[PDB]
Design a protein around this ligand. Structure first.
Ligand SMILES: *C(=O)CCCCCCCCCCCCC
Ligand SMILES: *C(=O)CCCCCCCCCCCCC
Ligand SMILES: *C(=O)CCCCCCCCCCCCC
Ligand SMILES: *C(=O)CCCCCCCCCCCCC
Ligand SMILES: *C(=O)CCCCCCCCCCCCC
Ligand SMILES: *C(=O)CCCCCCCCCCCCC
Ligand SMILES: [Cl-]
Ligand SMILES: [Cl-]
Ligand SMILES: [Zn+2]
Ligand SMILES: [Zn+2]
Lengths: 29, 21, 29, 21, 29, 21, 29, 21, 29, 21, 29, 21
């Protein structure tokens, strides 16, 4: 589903702004 | 899963805080 | 620093595209 | 780290793959 | 609806490029 | 509303000009 | 100026995420 | 303004909230 | 369809990262 | 068409390589 | 160079919005 | 080119239109 890929691209930018120096891990699978 | 929670329902800013290292 | 933040914003976008289903860990300086 | 290398020099796709899980 | 949030993120970048120095106001509600 | 106009139908560049300060 | 424009592009994206349903007024220098 | 402060110093989430409606 | 416009905005950033110095052409029609 | 191929089905990185000059 | 890459990332986004259905050819230096 | 002009000086919408197909 292409809609999943588009939403993930907005999740990575949200985690980057929120986590900041802490960092984030993105793991859909 | 973050894909199964924050992409099927809109997540507030604090909901994104949970996955921070 | 400000410009370092801007590079990371595009950096996480690039990492998300390149990795894909594998995912990644983002750790800043 | 990732910032210390890719934000000062352009990183190729192979170099980005080293940061993937 | 998540599709509303995604479209809004593209509206803010469109207003920023169009308005420029004038500025913009985003008010969905 | 901008959400009810430019997000249910595609808006041209001038359609975005209306909401500029 | 060019780099100031780039910061504003990410700035409006950050403001959109942080505020949300409230909305915001963006006024540049 | 917003540019004069946040584009020269990193603005925290509380500082961004001051610009919200 | 607005979903077409959103996906195209992600295609242009994917071509830019992939093509790099080569460059890309975007031609939906 | 790139719109009719990479936007109705998810395209891998190499699928984007085809349209590079 | 790094900052030149960042400007191009926003440049292709701006060109995509402005042109629209016409499309464009992006050629870097 | 496009980079040599718009990445050193802010390009207006008309100038961007010159690069459209
Ligand atoms: C990896 O494949 C993620 C596993 C869960 C995917 C769920 C996809 C459901 C289809 C999309 C529904 C929501 C559309 C915005
Ligand atoms: C976080 O504190 C950043 C640490 C890296 C050092 C930043 C400055 C390195 C020298 C570059 C100076 C260029 C800007 C005047
Ligand atoms: C605030 O909630 C905005 C009020 C109007 C919302 C309309 C949402 C309609 C559902 C989405 C339809 C279009 C999907 C792209
Ligand atoms: C719009 O005209 C911008 C006004 C703010 C002043 C910009 C320059 C401030 C001093 C920084 C110089 C650094 C770049 C050489
Ligand atoms: C120009 O109009 C492009 C020609 C092909 C458009 C196909 C649009 C199909 C409707 C969207 C289906 C997929 C939604 C993600
Ligand atoms: C690719 O090689 C870029 C070619 C353009 C020249 C870049 C440098 C021009 C002078 C600006 C120096 C400012 C940074 C110290
Ligand atoms: Cl930048
Ligand atoms: Cl989207
Ligand atoms: Zn999007
Ligand atoms: Zn940038």
């Amino acid at each position: 589903f292409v809609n999943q890929h588009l939403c993930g691209s907005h999740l990575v930018e949200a985690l980057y702004l929120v986590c900041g120096e802490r960092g984030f891990f993105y793991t859909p699978k | 899963g973050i894909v199964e929670q924050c992409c099927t329902s809109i997540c507030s800013l604090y909901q994104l805080e949970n996955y921070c290292n």
